[PDB]
Amino acid sequence: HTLPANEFRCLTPEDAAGVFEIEREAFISVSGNCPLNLDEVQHFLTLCPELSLGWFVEGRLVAFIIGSLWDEERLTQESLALHRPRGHSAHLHALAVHRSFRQQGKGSVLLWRYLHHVGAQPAVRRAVLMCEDALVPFYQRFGFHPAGPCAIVVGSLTFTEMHCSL
Ligand SMILES: CC(C)(COP(=O)(O)OP(=O)(O)OC[C@H]1O[C@@H](n2cnc3c(N)ncnc32)[C@H](O)[C@@H]1OP(=O)(O)O)[C@@H](O)C(=O)NCCC(=O)NCCSCC(=O)NCCc1c[nH]c2ccc(Br)cc12
Ligand SMILES: [Mg+2]
């Protein structure tokens, strides 16, 4: 009978459109490319929805994290489009907050909830992601440790790999 003020839940393929719209402004508008295109988000939201998390305000998505499992120490080009069911690493492919809602704890809150949520599942022993040099200190506030240049290639941008033990 009503839209909740704030709702945190795992995503489903139907949320595919919403997340892509957020990415268009968060990533594409800034680099001409984005972590996951509509098909790649549907993919992960189909095989591993439990590895995703979204914040909805009044029925609209305002923040999300899309992940999958990985089974290797470091991230590689192929990990970009894979889900290793037997992996013990939660690979965060994308983390973004809607333009009109940034700078007010949302990202930090979603990330901590995500960490505990995924860390609830005993199989998952670690969380990994790629990030721009300027966000390294941000992720360190969460227990992540810089782990050198990430091997993954994307246009001309450079990334530092971050590893967090759960
Ligand atoms: C970074 C987030 C998620 C944080 O959300 P917020 O709700 O604003 O965070 P808050 O909890 O309010 O706190 C924000 C803190 O982070 C800092 N911060 C936020 N944005 C930035 C920025 N652009 N530069 C430096 N610091 C920043 C900020 O200063 C603040 O600290 P403060 O308290 O001292 O002011 C938000 O700004 C956002 O959605 N930005 C746009 C998307 C983004 O940058 N996502 C994260 C990237 S790392 C994780 C990730 O998804 N990596 C994939 C890599 C990748 C793959 N393919 C690609 C193609 C293109 C591009 Br480009 C990138 C890729
Ligand atoms: Mg060039």
Side-chain angles (χ1 to χ4, degrees):
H1 55 291
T2 178
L3 307 173
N6 295 92
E7 154 167 28
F8 304 74
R9 66 172 182 72
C10 288
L11 262 30
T12 81
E14 302 141 84
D15 298 299
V19 333
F20 189 56
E21 288 309 307
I22 290 182
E23 290 191 82
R24 292 177 64 268
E25 180 285 326
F27 306 101
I28 302 175
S29 90
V30 181
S31 64
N33 188 17
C34 68
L36 304 160
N37 63 24
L38 185 70
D39 225 76
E40 296 174 322
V41 314
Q42 290 186 310
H43 175 67
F44 293 126
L45 290 185
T46 291
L47 0 79
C48 44
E50 67 267 34
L51 287 184
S52 81
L53 193 55
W55 189 321
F56 292 74
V57 176
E58 316 275 337
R60 308 277 178 273
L61 180 66
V62 300
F64 72 87
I65 288 184
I66 302 298
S68 80
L69 290 175
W70 178 239
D71 58 353
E72 287 173 45
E73 179 181 307
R74 301 179 62 67
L75 254 27
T76 57
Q77 195 76 196
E78 61 172 356
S79 66
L80 239 35
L82 292 168
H83 170 57
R84 297 281 170 81
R86 315 257 71 188
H88 295 104
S89 290
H91 181 188
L92 303 267
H93 293 69
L95 163 54
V97 174
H98 181 104
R99 189 168 100 298
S100 313
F101 297 77
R102 296 171 188 144
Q103 302 196 65
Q104 39 184 47
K106 301 259 202 301
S108 292
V109 174
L110 207 197
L111 183 44
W112 269 119
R113 180 157 180 151
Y114 186 84
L115 255 26
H116 301 327
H117 159 65
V118 155
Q121 289 158 50
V124 176
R125 313 162 168 180
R126 177 187 68 158
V128 300
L129 71 310
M130 302 195 276
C131 84
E132 308 97 334
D133 292 11
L135 284 172
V136 173
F138 173 68
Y139 286 109
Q140 295 179 87
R141 303 174 181 175
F142 300 84
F144 282 89
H145 299 56
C150 181
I152 303 175
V153 175
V154 175
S156 47
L157 23 179
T158 317
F159 300 103
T160 289
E161 198 167 324
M162 311 292 291
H163 294 346
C164 178
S165 164
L166 284 14

